[PDB]
Write a protein that binds this ligand. Structure first.
Ligand SMILES: Cc1ncc(COP(=O)(O)O)c(/C=N/OCC[C@H](N)C(=O)O)c1O
Ligand SMILES: Cc1ncc(COP(=O)(O)O)c(/C=N/OCC[C@H](N)C(=O)O)c1O
Ligand code: NA
Ligand code: NA
Lengths: 383, 378
């Protein structure tokens, strides 16, 4: 079942980690619009970037570059393995470009028959026909007519299964370093390094979808940096624009040459993403993400001590998953709705897992107040 | 291109050296109210202080208001918002497929589309697009897409059957040489879709939101599609898009779905201006100003075989002597200080602001005449 807000919960205003609806009810936001508003609502630096670029230039076509795109590209190139950056609007679009690029690179550099894409059960990569087919939930890709072929799914974290299906006809392995929608499941170190080794062996490209786990979410700028495994292609969105739709596909010159250092990028979007990048990619903010994770986790542990609802607390940085015990299997939506009644916005990650993806700069006072509200909601659900 | 735009106001653009250009390209028919239009800047700033983002779990006031405006003004009863034309087309094509699957048969999957069509660059949309060069080389394409020539109603009749789920068409093919559907072709598509229980999908990403001098091209033609997509002009430069359909069709998936609050506030302001008698009338006045200049340029330099399009989507096809050289005129245009487009290597394309000042039409077309003069003087 999808989760939709009823007619009496329409957000009208946000500031920091607080949201107000049409009736003026105030909520603490631990959801971030699904890990998008990584610097909270109407952050003054992002508002300033939006307004100043908004007076100057909003739009160029892909025929032109613009100063905000150039500056953002340079920032991303300097901070990561990337040598080339392509900007788009959404994570779905960035993933489309990544997957097409892996396919095309294989086609032109090796063979038109080198087409297999390996992906993982419960993966989420977007809702376009190609991306949802690479995604690992057949319920979401069924019912749209013929899917793009040569996509093979195996279980996340099953390196043996990857080894078994990979071959010289394989062009890519596509993986979320942490599967956000798929129960907040993190890759193990041996699995992710194994993917890098298998891609090297088969001359396939390793594609990291960091749309959800990138741009500071894990407490490193990108999850790949936490793991110390470098992909061939990486995608980023959501937190990248802090609520403004923007995305990026990062790769090397060698790979991008199959298709300056940057291509595309809406001037307004890139100005906002530049401001977001400048704040997130700091020692102070990245350290604070770790401090804040532990504040949330301690609250979740306290709730569990009182109410006995969780079997596991997991995730990385400020992507937090809390798996419900068997006695509460399927109840994630109910805790989410009770949370909203109590004035706190949370997420699910499937029907058995609570998910939290607050602003990376969420104030300690908001953590405590929001988690008190969530405790109150838990009390109502399990009374 | 050989310059970097840094600032725009209306239909004038400045580069890093402060060189002033006249913009007849609109970032490819996107900045339909020109650069930094004060109403759009005001909407951006006001919503930008209030709320930028909601997930698809929620709606928001700008999305509800924009949905209402589009529903009241068009055949639509339901509106789904996305970021780009590509995303809106993905949603439209998936919806046509899914509707056929659940309302008729899982085997009802054929999509009919047209040679030279452009629908976006995602794997699915580029495969529905009609330029094999752009869909080749990405591995297995989504199947059950058949292409026939644009404007060939006989060919559509021949390929359509009970296993057909959709006909996808741009009422005017912008990228494909600025070719307009004939009335009998477009009406014919509606009749064949009715006969075969298929959905007629109009891609109005380029020709919609006032571009033709009607709010949507379907209104010009008087042929109502089942699904329509809109983007580009809809946000005036802010990335936003919409898929418009009926309740009966949308139910295969309240009245709106999705929509970025900031994007929808900007698009609401854009909609309010474009959907006015005066702006829509002006589009026709201005088209004739452009066309008169193109005619005078042809009288002096003898370079065009045809001037076509609708409203402020203008195509000027080059004579056989200049075939393949549209890029040469585009570059000479830029040197002369005017930003124009191509529509393939044989066609010049113009897609200026719908409110482009007459002074800018005359100045930009004088610069374009200079560019043409330079190219022809050899
Ligand atoms: C790992 C990962 N990859 C790709 C995407 C798609 O990015 P988007 O198009 O920017 O939403 C996402 C986006 N998730 O957003 C929640 C889902 C969304 N509400 C939807 O179903 O479209 C993601 O988490
Ligand atoms: C009829 C029609 N349908 C869909 C699209 C795609 O819209 P977009 O994703 O908003 O660019 C377009 C976009 N055209 O943009 C011009 C070319 C484009 N920038 C490219 O190179 O992909 C269109 O004209
Ligand atoms: Na680098
Ligand atoms: Na209507």
């Amino acid at each position: 079942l999808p989760v939709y807000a009823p007619a009496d919960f329409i957000p009208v205003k946000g500031k920091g980690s607080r949201v107000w609806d049409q009736q003026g009810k105030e909520y603490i936001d631990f959801a971030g619009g699904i890990a998008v508003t990584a610097l909270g609502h109407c952050h003054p630096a992002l508002v300033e970037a939006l307004k100043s670029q908004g007076e100057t230039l909003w739009h160029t076509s892909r025929v032109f570059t613009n100063e905000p795109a150039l500056r953002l590209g340079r920032k991303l190139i300097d901070a990561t393995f990337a040598e080339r950056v392509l900007f788009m609007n959404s994570g779905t679009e960035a993933n489309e470009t990544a997957f097409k690029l892996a396919r095309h690179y294989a086609c032109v550099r090796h063979s038109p028959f080198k087409t297999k894409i390996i992906a993982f059960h419960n993966a989420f990569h977007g809702r376009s026909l190609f991306t949802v087919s690479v995604g690992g939930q057949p319920k979401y890709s069924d019912g749209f007519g013929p899917k793009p072929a040569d996509i093979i799914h195996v279980p996340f974290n099953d390196l043996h299964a990857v080894k078994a299906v990979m071959d010289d006809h394989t062009c890519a392995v596509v993986v979320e370093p942490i599967q956000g929608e798929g129960g907040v499941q993190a890759a193990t170190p041996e699995f992710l390094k194994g993917l890098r080794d298998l891609c090297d062996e088969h001359q396939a490209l390793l594609v990291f979808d960091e749309v959800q786990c990138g741009m500071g979410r894990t407490g490193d700028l990108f999850a790949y940096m936490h793991y110390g495994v470098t992909p061939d292609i990486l995608t980023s969105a959501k937190a990248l624009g802090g609520g403004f739709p923007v995305s990026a596909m990062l790769t090397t010159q060698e790979i991008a040459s199959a298709f300056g250092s940057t291509y595309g990028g809406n001037p307004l979007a890139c100005a906002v993403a530049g401001a977001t990048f400048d704040i997130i990619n700091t020692p102070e903010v990245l350290q604070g993400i770790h401090t804040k994770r532990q504040q949330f986790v301690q609250h979740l542990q306290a709730i569990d001590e009182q109410f006995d609802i969780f079997s596991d607390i997991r995730g990385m940085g400020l992507l937090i998953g809390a798996e419900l015990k068997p006695k509460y299997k399927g109840r994630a939506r109910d805790f989410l709705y009770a949370g909203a009644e109590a004035g706190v916005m949370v997420l699910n990650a499937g029907a058995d897992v609570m998910r939290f993806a607050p602003s990376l700069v969420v104030e300690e006072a908001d953590i405590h107040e929001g988690m008190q509200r969530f405790a109150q909601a838990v009390g109502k659900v399990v009374a």
